[PDB]
Nucleic acid binder design. Structure first.
Lengths: 73, 53, 112, 101, 92
RNA sequence: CUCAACACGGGGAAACUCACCAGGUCCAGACACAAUAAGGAUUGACAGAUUGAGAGCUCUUUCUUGAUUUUGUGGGUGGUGGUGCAUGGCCGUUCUUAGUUGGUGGAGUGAUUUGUCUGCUUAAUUGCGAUAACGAACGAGACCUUAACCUACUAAAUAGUGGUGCUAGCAUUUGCUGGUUAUCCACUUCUUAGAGGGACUAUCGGUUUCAAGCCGAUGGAAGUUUGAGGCAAUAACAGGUCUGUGAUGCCCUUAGACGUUCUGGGCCGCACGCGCGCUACACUGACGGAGCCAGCGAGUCUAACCUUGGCCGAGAGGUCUUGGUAAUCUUGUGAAACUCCGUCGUGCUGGGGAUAGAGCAUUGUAAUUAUUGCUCUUCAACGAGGAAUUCCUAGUAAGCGCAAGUCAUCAGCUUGCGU
């Protein structure tokens, strides 16, 4: 062993850096002063109405779960 | 990462190891000793294995 | 119980050797010289053979209550079923273990 | 009274025989039937390592031995005197177990 | 270490509670026998404490031996507890 | 890499071991400083792409996480990475032998020498002796373990023996062979193991300077130091080992890693040369029935170890139970050579069983590059081995198997043990 060749394409590629978007916590705001749910809550008893279900394409996906909460709609 | 230590270690030289130095070569597991050949020879006197004949 | 005497008597030996190497490493600075176990019903006891018992027995019971916990945590003894004593040394001028540690630490102070 | 059995196991001859001697001496201090010490055959536990680390040199072998001596005494006694005689003769290196029946 | 905060709390309280940790040199050992957390967490949390002081470690026969020093017992109070509590075997 | 490398590294590697090869993750980069950062430092992920892969690897998507992380600068840590010609420890070897060294005195300018020796003796620098040496120390011996003897002591349903009850068969006449888990009693020859005894070359004879000894006979369990080991000097080797060690200096590397882990593969690949071995070349034999005899040992509680007995199966094996943490059960380990009766009949034949085909099982996550076992078939060389060369002196050589180590499975190896 003298050196390394790295015949694999030259990938020092790393993960997405927990992608830094702007401020995002927004239900919606009407005038004086009410707020209503968008990106609705989960059906989990252990998700006590505080989690947002992402809608990618015909999917509802929770992030409180490690992997999978699928209430599809 | 769910594949990190996933290979089974239930028999053979990969599972067992020395209790003094954690090696896999020259292990003595007679009477449940689990000490390598070289480690046992340095402390056979403390265990109570003397050399008579 | 429920262990054959062949495995029982051997396991007592390896337990002693593990204890002895522990105290050589731990009480190196107190002139340690040996141990002996007395396996009795109702709190098996351990005696430490070290010259400076005033150092091994720390301030107000520390430094041996710590070692009592360290042994019973590692060897899974019930609490209060092991106690550690320290009586000093019988004539430390004649123990080769104690005179080798004396020789060792004298070298580390840069003595010729 | 009750039928009892005391089993002694050690790796030291000198430290074991006097303990059994104290057992029988306390047995006819206040007299009761002995079924005295029946010595089982000694067990020699042999470990045969090679001699070395790495295998250079003449292929020399060692053998190490641990000797297990075992003795059992089958006594009968009143319930009171059982505990005291089982607790007085306690010596390092000798493992004593007492079977109730 | 990421080592989520509710697992520092289990580790640090138990070190305050007894003053000693032994913990079994084996990484990825899957739920250390005394504390409810992983054995990797126990070994790596107290490596962090040792480098800054606060605890002294001994290693023997694939086992660690952790002893809380006098500069660590005072620090571990405001981390977890109130004053006038004795961590180690100083309690008689 | 001669003895002092080559069934050696306890090295019988399918994964693991593992150090090597093609690839994929992870940090297990402590702490300190500085920056980003509660308008979020950061972490994790469904489905699809992608991937050997149900690795959120990475990407598409948009949820979760919250101050531990991230980035940079120094370090830290790890390494079966290098150097055994930088070292420790261990071991081998010089070296199956008898050798080595102070103190005081003597010799010599001195390095050194004598002591530590002409002779005889011993396994021995073991002794008798001689003596410018005297008195000593280590090694040898002494010592310890083990194998042989004890009708002696101490007693044993975890070892036996005899009688006694109950009972089986046969003879019958009172006998012989048995069974009976404690029926009871008694004992310790055999077995066990504590303490001891016992051999000292004893008695006699012969030899030598008449000493140390040696030889022969008798007695004795034992007469080679009773047999076998263990232990084991001074000085050394550039002997081996950094791949036993959280033994270790220096060098290298330290995030696309030489760390670690995961899937695959390799270490086993074959024109060929060498070392240790196994099976053979048959009639002192092969095959088939029948007899039937050991010793050393190992064995499972929060884990599946040694397995009896019944049943199934040609076998390998399966299944239902049982005993055993063991002088109790496996186990009387009913081992093999061996012995008796028969078949073969001098024919590479019924010697030999390499190579190969098909099936059935077992261990394992996994058996292909056959793990191994079994069944049928295939039937190779080999007709006693040139020059060379090894080991061995009595319960030894050689033949013969058995247990243990390694082990989940694999013994053609080793360590012991008996015949």
């Amino acid at each position: 062993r003298k050196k390394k060749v790295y015949t694999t394409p030259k990938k020092i590629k790393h993960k997405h850096k927990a992608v830094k978007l702007a401020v995002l916590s927004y239900y919606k705001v009407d005038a004086e002063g009410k707020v209503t749910k968008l990106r609705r809550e989960c059906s989990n008893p252990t998700c006590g109405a505080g989690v947002f279900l992402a809608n990618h394409k015909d999917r509802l996906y929770c992030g409180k779960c490690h992997s999978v909460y699928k209430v599809n709609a | 990462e769910n594949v990190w230590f996933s290979h089974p270690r239930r028999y053979g030289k990969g599972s067992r190891q020395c209790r003094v130095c954690s090696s896999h070569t020259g292990l003595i597991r007679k009477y449940g000793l689990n000490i390598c050949r070289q480690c046992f020879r340095e402390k056979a006197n403390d265990i109570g294995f003397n050399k008579f004949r | 119980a429920l262990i054959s005497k062949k495995r029982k008597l051997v396991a007592d030996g390896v337990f002693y050797a593990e204890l002895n190497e522990f105290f050589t490493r731990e009480l190196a600075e107190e002139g340690y010289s040996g141990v002996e176990v007395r396996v009795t019903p109702t709190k098996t006891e351990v005696i430490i053979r070290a010259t400076r018992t005033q150092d091994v027995l720390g301030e107000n019971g520390r430094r041996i209550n710590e070692l009592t916990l360290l042994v019973q945590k590692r060897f899974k003894y019930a609490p209060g079923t092991i106690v550690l004593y320290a009586e000093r040394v019988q004539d430390r001028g004649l123990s080769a273990v104690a005179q080798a540690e004396s020789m060792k630490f004298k070298l580390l102070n840069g003595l010729a | 009274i009750i039928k009892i059995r005391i089993t002694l196991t050690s790796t030291k001859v000198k430290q074991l025989e006097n303990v059994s001697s104290n057992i029988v001496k306390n047995a006819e201090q206040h007299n009761l039937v002995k079924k005295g010490p029946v010595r089982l055959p000694t067990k020699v536990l042999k470990i045969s390592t090679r001699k070395t680390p790495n295998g250079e040199g003449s292929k020399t072998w060692e053998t190490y031995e641990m000797r297990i001596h075992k003795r059992y005494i089958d006594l009968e006694a009143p319930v009171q005197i059982v505990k005291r005689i089982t607790q007085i003769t306690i010596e390092p290196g000798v493992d004593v177990e007492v079977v109730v029946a | 270490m990421l080592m989520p905060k509710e697992d520092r709390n289990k580790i640090h309280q138990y070190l305050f509670q007894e003053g000693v940790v032994v913990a079994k040199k084996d990484f990825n050992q899957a739920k250390h026998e005394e504390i409810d957390t992983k054995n990797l967490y126990v070994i790596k949390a107290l490596q962090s404490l040792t480098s800054k002081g606060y605890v002294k470690t001994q290693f023997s026969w694939q086992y660690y031996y952790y002893t809380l020093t006098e500069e660590g017992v005072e620090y571990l109070r405001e981390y977890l507890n109130l004053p006038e509590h004795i961590v180690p075997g100083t309690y008689i």
